């Protein structure tokens, strides 16, 4: 059958996909910039398809409801046929692999801690052993699910606190979490992926930092629906771009070449 | 059809697979220890198969001859039907993906520099700009192929020197390379994967070290022949073990918990 424009789901998450300053006078894919916008263009070229970037309707990564088994976020879009591919900082997880396919990873990450500078916290164990400083994670993402299922005493203890914390310690978007750290006088710390932590650490006002080692070792993959023709070509594209140096170049472009903190 | 014992190809490469001290009085899989021996046991359990570890006959990772298109090493064993799966520090590369399947990566690495302590070399550029200190790579592996195809001025310059260097700067095994660094009075440096470099840095006599940043960002994958039933189960096994913490535990076990250099 004839080639058709591929519907790409992605998420507004800096510096992966961001609105261009002048987006109001732009159309289509041209409205957007970032690592994943650059990566989509390269994947598309190698795979030989035309594509339309579409921001995920519900603004979520993807979680399955325990009772209903319904998926939301970008994972849901793939599962229910509203997108052909997800090119986003979407973490490869076993439960997600039940319902979608992931490419080999194009970027590594692990769960990490973001503090406001000066906060007397160096580690997850530190957080777990006190109550003065609140802490949380993003809703409907892999970090929250990590804590929910972890067996580890410290993380299990963190999860027991976070799940019942009031007011809620969970946030709707990464930017909300970062804003919360910045304005809570060191009484909130944020659990988020090292990639996003390390990005924000080099953004003005330069008042946050990453502390501790990463809690785990994971990757982002390009996701396609089960049985999609596209998966094979996508996986070869990722390997090619890795070997060409493109993944390294794009990481440096969007994290460090553009860093605002000296 | 009935389950059959799975023939696993692997390679004697420390600390992935090593002979046990008392191997002469042991049989079968019990002759061996290391990261990949531990990983094979876990993969097998999750995938529900019985297996036989078999050291690759020609002692090589895998390279394709330019003229004949024949494959050697573990890749060859999979290609020609002499093994069902490779569980080894086998690097995921696009050319290898032509003829075998790789799982998602279970360990990260990049090409790095090993020096004898005291050698006035901090980087690949350093090596490229002088002739007093010789340098090389392992034959029939991904590091040599990296230099052979690289476009980068420094690496292209390194490749031009290495390919014509006399006496040969290439080595038959990693241990030969390490031994060569140790006994060449700082006049040989060795290009090898960060994983193996970082292992040897914590081995007596503690006379080597890693210098510079990694030249690339790659991973090891479990490899199966094209069309193997096993690939799907293997990929889910890797994701499960990642999420359980097993990959982190085994890395720490074989690299750092056992370090000999304080
Ligand atoms: C540039 C890059 C390439 C690859 C990865 C991560 C990265 S990284 O952006 O996470 N990179 C930045 C520089 N170093 C910190 C290494 C990690 S990855 O480990 O997830 N996957 C690799 C290979 C792609 C096929 C599987 C392994 C490419
Ligand atoms: C423990 C570990 C787990 C995984 C990787 C690497 C590693 S690591 O041994 O290379 N690890 C050691 C500790 N840190 C240095 C992070 C890297 S990986 O990036 O190659 N692959 C991940 C996920 C497995 C599915 C794809 C991503 C698991
Ligand atoms: N990368 C995560 C979202 C961020 C997070 O959970 O910290 C995901 O795919 O769910
Ligand atoms: N891991 C490499 C071997 C070691 C090297 O080339 O440095 C491979 O699969 O070829």
UniProtKB/Swiss-Prot annotation, chains A, B:
The record marks 121 as: Crucial to convey clamshell closure to channel opening. The keyword Magnesium does not apply. The record marks 64, 148, 240 as: Interaction with the cone snail toxin Con-ikot-ikot. Palmitoylated. Depalmitoylated upon L-glutamate stimulation. Ubiquitinated by RNF167, leading to its degradation. L-glutamate binds at residues 89, 91, 96, 142-143, 193. Detected in forebrain. Detected in dendrites of neuronal cells. Expressed in the pyramidal cell layers of CA1 and CA3 and in the granule cell layer of the dentate gyrus. One of its GO terms (molecular function) is kainate selective glutamate receptor activity. Belongs to the glutamate-gated ion channel (TC 1.A.10.1) family. GRIA2 subfamily. The postsynaptic actions of L-glutamate are mediated by a variety of receptors that are named according to their selective agonists. This receptor binds AMPA (quisqualate) > L-glutamate > kainate. This is Glutamate receptor 2. It comes from Rattus norvegicus. The lineage of its organism: Eukaryota, Metazoa, Chordata, Craniata, Vertebrata. The chain holds residues 413 to 795 of 883 of the full protein.
